[PDB]
Design a protein around this nucleic acid. Sequence first.
RNA 1: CUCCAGGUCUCUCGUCGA
RNA 2: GGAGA
Length: 463
Amino acid sequence: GEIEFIESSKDAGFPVINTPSKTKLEPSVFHQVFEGNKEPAVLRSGDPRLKANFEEAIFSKYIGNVNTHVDEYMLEAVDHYAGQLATLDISTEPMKLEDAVYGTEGLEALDLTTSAGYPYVALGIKKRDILSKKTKDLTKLKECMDKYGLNLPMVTYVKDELRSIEKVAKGKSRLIEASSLNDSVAMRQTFGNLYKTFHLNPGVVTGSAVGCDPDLFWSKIPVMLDGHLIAFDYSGYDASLSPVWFACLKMILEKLGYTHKETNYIDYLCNSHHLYRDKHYFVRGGMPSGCSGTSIFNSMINNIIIRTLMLKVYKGIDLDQFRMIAYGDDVIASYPWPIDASLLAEAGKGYGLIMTPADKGECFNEVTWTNVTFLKRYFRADEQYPFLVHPVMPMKDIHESIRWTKDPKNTQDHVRSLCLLAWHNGEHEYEEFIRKIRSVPVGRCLTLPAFSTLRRKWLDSFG
RNA sequence: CUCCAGGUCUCUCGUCGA
RNA sequence: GGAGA
Ligand SMILES: Nc1ccn([C@H]2CC[C@@H](COP(=O)(O)OP(=O)(O)OP(=O)(O)O)O2)c(=O)n1
């Protein structure tokens, strides 16, 4: 990922974009009961907690690119992953517009509560001015698409969210890229059946966890990844993808039946253009976080990436015995033999990728089923039914969430949802949690689910 | 006097119906 | 800046 060019938006006929600088996160009634290290992310240059240049820091994610060709490893990598995807009958036929916009089995409708992006964001137009789920109208949509076209700039905002205290101090707030309604629709039309087949089939064939429910799915995972575990973390994956990985992705899209016409939408992702406040700029490489397809294409690329590193580092390796599940940058995998992920990291570095030891730390340790995480959840088998596995979100991360709110009107929903995460920590931990919640006047006013009821419904789901 | 801040997945709750 | 009660 690299910013090639910056220009004034006026110069390029673009309006200045209103980008919020005030967080919506307030300390909650539970802010004191529990301990936490996160505060809301820095959103402006005048933040008193800033110990570094803000605008320098938020964009620092664009580490650079590496100029390499699609090498013999990538190519093999692609043919292998493609051969899996071929077993699924991914239709390259464009999705019916009513389905691409207002949802179908395997693909939910557009988020109508979010920005419509450029140009509408500066015309003061909301998604709901153009769409209604209730009416399923496409009239105003086609109109707007005719008028404004495709490949519009993506609008860059800072994400309102909690960050570690060093990420607050270092200004490493996160950027997202608001994709225009038009582009989201066009991509969903073009790639809807791919999205759908992916969501309806998470596992070791797609190599994707997208569409799974950790409650039900954690039990399936150790069966699928029966070998020795492989797991690492990425630093700024999305921003680290050089163009060659996109070339790889286009090539696998081509294998699947996609025309050069349709693969060209990948070009709008790799080579993208953005609005940020009063500037218009160009990024070469990097997956733009916020485009349509970001989870699916990030994941497909990860399947190509890890396959490549293996084929490269361990020359003569049998990928028919390799198994991986990716969720964007997040990956859990296994191979029948011990693989040194520090070496896969060294290789990764040569392709622009920064891979680090899993779940923080400074050794590429053994990855056991004990310490491995996926989607931030640990794996624990039931003590009573050892083939059912618990997705275990650390209580410390649940704690971080409850200590804040964006609106106390939601405290009941918020806490209930937190409960459905916490209980997989066990009865001891859940009741301590329910106690600490109850240790505060407002906590005594909430309907909390009983552990016994949670465990019951869970066991009941496997039926 | 409010609103402006992306893609998605999962779950949950609210309302309305068979 | 724009949209609205
Ligand atoms: N609002 C968000 C937050 C995250 N993500 C996706 C894109 C990248 C992926 C990883 O994000 P995190 O791991 O949660 O961020 P981090 O580990 O703190 O920072 P980094 O991406 O540098 O590892 O999640 C997203 O699409 N939208």
